[PDB]
Amino acid sequence: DLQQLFENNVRWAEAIKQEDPDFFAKLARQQTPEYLWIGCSDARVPANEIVGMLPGDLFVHRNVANVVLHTDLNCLSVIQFAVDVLKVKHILVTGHYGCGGVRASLHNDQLGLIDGWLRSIRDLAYEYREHLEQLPTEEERVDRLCELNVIQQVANVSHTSIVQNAWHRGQSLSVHGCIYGIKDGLWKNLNVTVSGLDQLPPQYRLSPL
């Protein structure tokens, strides 16, 4: 039954309109979010509710296990529109504990198309195989890889020419790494924020155009 979702919507919209009849009218005039959320598609991680944001506040990309690839025009279009047009001040890279995409990367089952998508997280598990092996349970390994993945994705966003050119032309722009606990509703800072070119390794820095 899809009519519930429709009936919830009319209910939601009309409730808002009696509290502030101009809410959508004003909102529809300009898009000025300060934040881009790059997070997982997982149903248990909705961005706005988690950080208490209202419509208009958060530009959002969500994909499986919040993966950012430098050949992916899907995510890169979100990042570039966020950064070059909307000129967000902040990019919130948010992974979450118990992420099935990360977990799939740590196991050996073929899931099909998504096998390719998760390659770079599988790579991360190989890179940290000594660190992860050293952890006694599967849940610990999955959860640690989740942190590692977020931290990696933050690097990926920051190395984009999109982000570096924002900085080159003096734009205020910070990239953050957070992880959400689906078990407790808490959104945790991973303290890996990047806010400028000086924070990038020499091998990854691009010269201005």
- Binders of Zn ion among residues 63 to 122 (CB under 5 A) are 65, 99, 101
Out of 87, 100, 151, 168, which residue is the one contacting a copy of itself (CB under 8 A)?
Answer: 100
Contacts of residue 171, defined as CB under 8 A and 6 or more positions apart, other chains included, come to 83, 87
Task: For residue 179, give the nearest of 141, 157, 153, 155 by alpha carbon.
Answer: 153
Question: Which is nearer to a copy of itself, 5 or 130 (by Cβ)?
Answer: 5
| CA separation for the pair 26, 104 (Å, rounded) | 43
Joined tokens for residue 118: 């998760």
Q: Name the H helices within the chain.
A: 3-19, 23-27, 47-51, 73-80, 100-106, 114-117, 119-127, 129-132, 138-159, 161-168
Residues numbered 156-175 forming contacts with a copy of itself, rule: CB under 8 A: 162
Active site residue 99: yes
Catalytic annotation, pick one of 11, 44, 70, 169: 44
Q: Which of 96, 141, 144, 159 is catalytic?
A: 96
Per-residue binder mask for a copy of itself (CB under 8 A), 66-85, x = binder: -x-x--xxxxxxx-xxx-xx
**Measured from the CB of residue 2, what is the shortest distance to a copy of itself in angstroms?**
6
Our CB check for a copy of itself shows the closer of 27 and 123 to be: 27
Q: How far is the CB of 95 from a copy of itself (least distance, A)?
A: 15
Place of tokens 């050293």: 134
- Asked if residue 47 binds a copy of itself (CB under 8 A), the reply is yes
Kindly tell me which of 146 and 166 has the beta carbon lying closer to Zn ion: 146
42 catalytic residue (yes or no): yes
- Pairwise CA distance, residues 51 & 177, whole Å: 14
- Work out whether 23 is an interface residue with a copy of itself (CB under 8 A): yes
Under rule CB under 5 A, residue 40 binds Zn ion: yes
Q: Could you write out the DSSP letters of every residue in 86-98?
A: S--SEEEEEEETT
- Let me know if 40 is a catalytic residue: yes
Residue from 75, 99, 146, 178 carrying the catalytic annotation:
99
Length of the chain in terms of residues written: 209
Tell me which residue of 95, 61, 55, 60 sits closest to 75, measured CA to CA.
Answer: 61
Residue set of the binding site: 40, 42, 96, 99
Residues known to be catalytic: 40, 42, 44, 96, 99
Residues annotated within the binding site for Zn(2+) are: 40, 42, 96, 99
